[PDB]
Amino acid sequence: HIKKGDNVKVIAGKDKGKEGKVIATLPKKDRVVVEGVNIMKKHQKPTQLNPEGGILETEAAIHVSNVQLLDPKTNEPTRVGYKFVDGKKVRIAKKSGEEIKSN
RNA sequence: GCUGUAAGUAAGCUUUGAUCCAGAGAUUUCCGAAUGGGGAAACCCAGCAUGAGUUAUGUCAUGUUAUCGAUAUGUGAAUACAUAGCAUAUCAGAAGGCACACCCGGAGAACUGAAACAUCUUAGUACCCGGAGGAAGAGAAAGAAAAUUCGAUUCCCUUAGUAGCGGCGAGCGAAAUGGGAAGAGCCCAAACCAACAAGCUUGCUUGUUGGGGUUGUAGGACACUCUAGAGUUACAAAGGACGACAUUAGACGAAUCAUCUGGAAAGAUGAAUCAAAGAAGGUAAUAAUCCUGUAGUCGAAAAUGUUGUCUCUCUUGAGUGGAUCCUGAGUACGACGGAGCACGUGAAAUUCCGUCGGAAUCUGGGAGGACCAUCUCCUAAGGCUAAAUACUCUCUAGUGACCGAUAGUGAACCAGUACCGUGAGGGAAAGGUGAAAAGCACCCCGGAAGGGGAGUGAAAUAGAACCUGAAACCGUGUGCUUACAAGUAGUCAGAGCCCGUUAAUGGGUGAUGGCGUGCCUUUUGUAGAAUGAACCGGCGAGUUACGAUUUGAUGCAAGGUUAA
RNA sequence: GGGUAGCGGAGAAAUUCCAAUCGAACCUGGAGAUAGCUGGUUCUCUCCGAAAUAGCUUUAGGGCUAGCCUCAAGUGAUGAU
RNA sequence: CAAUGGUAGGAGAGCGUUCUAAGGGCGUUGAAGCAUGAUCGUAAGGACAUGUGGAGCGCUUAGAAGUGAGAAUGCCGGUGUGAGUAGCGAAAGACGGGUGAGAAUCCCGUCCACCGAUUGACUAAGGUUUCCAGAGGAAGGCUCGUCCGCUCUGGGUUAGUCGGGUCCUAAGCUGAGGCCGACAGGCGUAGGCGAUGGAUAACAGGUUGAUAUUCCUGUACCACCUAUAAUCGUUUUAAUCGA
RNA sequence: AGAUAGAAAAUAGGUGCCCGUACCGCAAACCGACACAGGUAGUCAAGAUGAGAAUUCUAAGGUGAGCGAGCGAACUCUCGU
RNA sequence: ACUCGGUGAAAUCAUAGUACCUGUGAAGAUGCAGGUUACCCGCGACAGGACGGAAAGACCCCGUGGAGCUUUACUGUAGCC
Ligand SMILES: [Mg+2]
Ligand SMILES: [Mg+2]
Ligand SMILES: [Mg+2]
Ligand SMILES: [Mg+2]
Ligand SMILES: [Mg+2]
Ligand SMILES: [Mg+2]
Ligand SMILES: [Mg+2]
Ligand SMILES: [Mg+2]
């Protein structure tokens, strides 16, 4: 499981071996949108809300099973564990020490 | 991160702990047993009290106001006391619902089987009603047995389709013994009574106050002499006070990278790793190592079942005589008429119900399948009682040589719904775009529906009626045929004309000759004008349980074999 | 506006009516009633291969033995001309 | 060397479909299905190649069965033929103008015709939104349709006096206590419910797209309450209160 | 019968609740599966002619019927001679 | 009814390139044998046949099939004495 703004690598899809920062989580479907991933080409029609339209290139969501956090020490793809610092479930990179998720 | 499904656009809420998830509490409109009166449920119309309002009236709010029960007081007829009867007050007393199950009663068919039918069978079944309880019924011997009693009850296996009952027909059909599950005995009347409340003159007596002891070795009072464990599941019956696991939220939880093909890999290839975890489900394809998990471990504020105790609350245990006394009455039991018991008013002894009769009190009474005499066993006519046992509307976890949308529930999808019927009721049809909605910006014809490009996508004969897309059926092309012919439409023989394979003594069409009246069912016999099918597709009929017989097979054999 | 309900009701009587067919309405349940009757019964080859007759039958288009098939043991000239 | 037609029927050997156990395999470098083909075995049937198809499925041995369809006037669903046939559901239309992509069929006008104890006006029962104004044209209208009882959007029903509730009761239905009843329940008194009846105070005109004894203008009437009263007068009788 | 010190009188102010109200109603909105030639209680109901609510034409007011255009054979149907 | 424009079913149906005569036959033939006749495809019409369609014979006979009814059939029975 990953966080709202951390930097992750992708291992599925046309995009692998590529980094990028997560921009949305949507935990009800476990699908995240990472920046520069799954670029989409959506045909938007000229309406009232949108004066004109075109082919927008927005990012689409991918299953959480396709992304991984990087070891903040060695940028090494890694899993994530936990430890009880003062009773708080804080995260660990599982190959090194503490991993920070502030934004 | 959120504001359900439900998309959206809008206003917002949230790290100050919200959102969510559990525990607990509060609000909980109207109808319905429906309960203030009425009523075509989800609506009308009130009495009373108290408050709001208005100068007042109209109006409104909140209690209350059904009927029964029981209890308690008032009052009290025809009538004199007194009773009906009235009139109040109180009380988590009763109502109604349901699990289409299970259980105990009351009532009780028929088609059917007997190759007819009446006895009998279906069957004490179905359907009705009345009670329940989570279980119920049954239960501590007037019981089997000729025993050496499993010493209460039930339930399982066998006895055994035996004994038996049967217009001795159809067909019904045990019980004991033995092997197991379960491991419970317990109180009241009766005698009698210290003391007392009431009629009696304390001589006799009444009582529910209470003790007393409840049983066949015959138990108990009696008279002696003697001595202070239980339990709320029967055995009286209430409830605080500490713990213990478990359950109605959860927490942690090992170990994988690279290339190849791809739209995407979990695949292939190579090299690793973990395993108390290679259950399972996801993930853009087939993952032990990506995710949710799994093995393992941990974890409750609370509100519950449960249980150890500590309290607590209850409280007499024997012997020996045996003179008297007591031990369940309109009862047993008999007669008549019925039911029940495997067994048909019959021997019905065993046992019940209606109608008449109607006993004994231990020096007694009942049973041992007409029966008696003797023997043996037991001690009725009062009561309570857990366990093994039956079932699943639910809830929790899981399983399946069970179904995969004409199946599996009727219902995978707003289904007991469309719809049908006045109503009881009856009751459908209907799942699948993609990985992601990326759901086709623009242009062109058209009023629009459509379409054709361009673009999205791996794919758009995946474009929303959307996966695959068969046949009947409808079209558009054409290679070869056909306008002198008599055709169950094929076969067999064959020229001509086109084509070229799963290359083999090849494929398509067919001038002309020979032979030739579909198929099923049913029949002595059917082209039959006997029957059945318009055509395609799907579904649609000797299976399963128990027992008997026979054959093959396999153990092993004067032995073989278990059932619960 | 109401009342009489199916072993019942109603009938100036026709077996007439009772929610479009009433010698006993409809709807459920016993219920998959029973049906000696008709119809249907689904893949292939190989081997053998009948009967439409007795006797008895509430029996005559049904059944039961017997005769006639088939399969497997056994018997071993018993069979036929 | 002999035998091999065959129905009721007996016997034997087998081919196929789903699932399971194990072993061994195939699969986006394209599975199952589907379609085609001139291929193989004695048959039930088995392969191979090429297209569509976009994920599962074969083979060996053995086990189990919802295992094989062409007929049951079988059931369900599709599609034929009859056939461009029958039918188009009582009737008088014509024409000018307009509207639109389109007009015998819609809007306006003129003429003509039909009803007129009614095809007219009301009002009940019943149906519930079909009512009105814009807009649309798939579907429904037995044709067409620019139209509508169709679809979309937004609207529309105003009461002291009208009809009910409120007041009364009939036929019936319920019925405390009560009578009778195997249970269930049936019957029934007092009392209630229940109009199709009895009793009850508003008329005219105007008014919009839709309402009007309802709204508004005019004028009224019936109940009820409050303030006031012009003197009714033992509050028994009264100005007068009454089951 | 009881009940009571009170309001009638000649005024002037106020208060009057719930339900139904659209629309069709001899009809394409109802009972007949249908925009069905059937059924659907009651009220008003004019003129000419007449005895009349008969009959023919018309007023008030509604309506021209949800398929048509041809040709005027057989044969049916309705009608006249 | 017929032609044209619009809309547009149904009963039925084993596949059908569906002739006549005389015969044969389950004894009354579009499908069989021997002859005779007949170019291919429509539209209006008639009804002889397809033992035409529709309804598992409104008659008849069987089923140890039902049902309703009758009586001095049997057995029983509410009720009455
Ligand atoms: Mg035939
Ligand atoms: Mg024929
Ligand atoms: Mg037929
Ligand atoms: Mg009668
Ligand atoms: Mg009749
Ligand atoms: Mg016929
Ligand atoms: Mg017949
Ligand atoms: Mg007849």
Distance separating alpha carbons of residues A80 and A64, to the nearest angstrom = 13
- Resolution, Å (one decimal): 2.5
State whether the Cα torsion A85-A91-A93-A99 is positive or negative: negative
For A52-83, give one letter per residue: b (16+ CB within 10 A) or e: eeeeeeebebbebebbbbbebeeeeebebeee
Strand B contacted by A7 CB (< 7 A): no
* Residue A14 token pair: 């046309």
Phi and psi for A33 in degrees, rounded to 5? -115, 130
Please enumerate in sequence order all residues whose Cβ is within 8 A of that of A71, keeping only pairs 6 or more positions apart, or say none. A77, A78, A93, A95, A96, A99
Distance separating alpha carbons of residues A58 and A75, to the nearest angstrom = 27
What distance in angstroms lies between residue A45's CA and the mean position of ligand 6's atoms? 70
What distance in angstroms lies between residue A70's CA and the mean position of ligand 2's atoms? 89
Experimental technique for the deposited model: cryo-EM
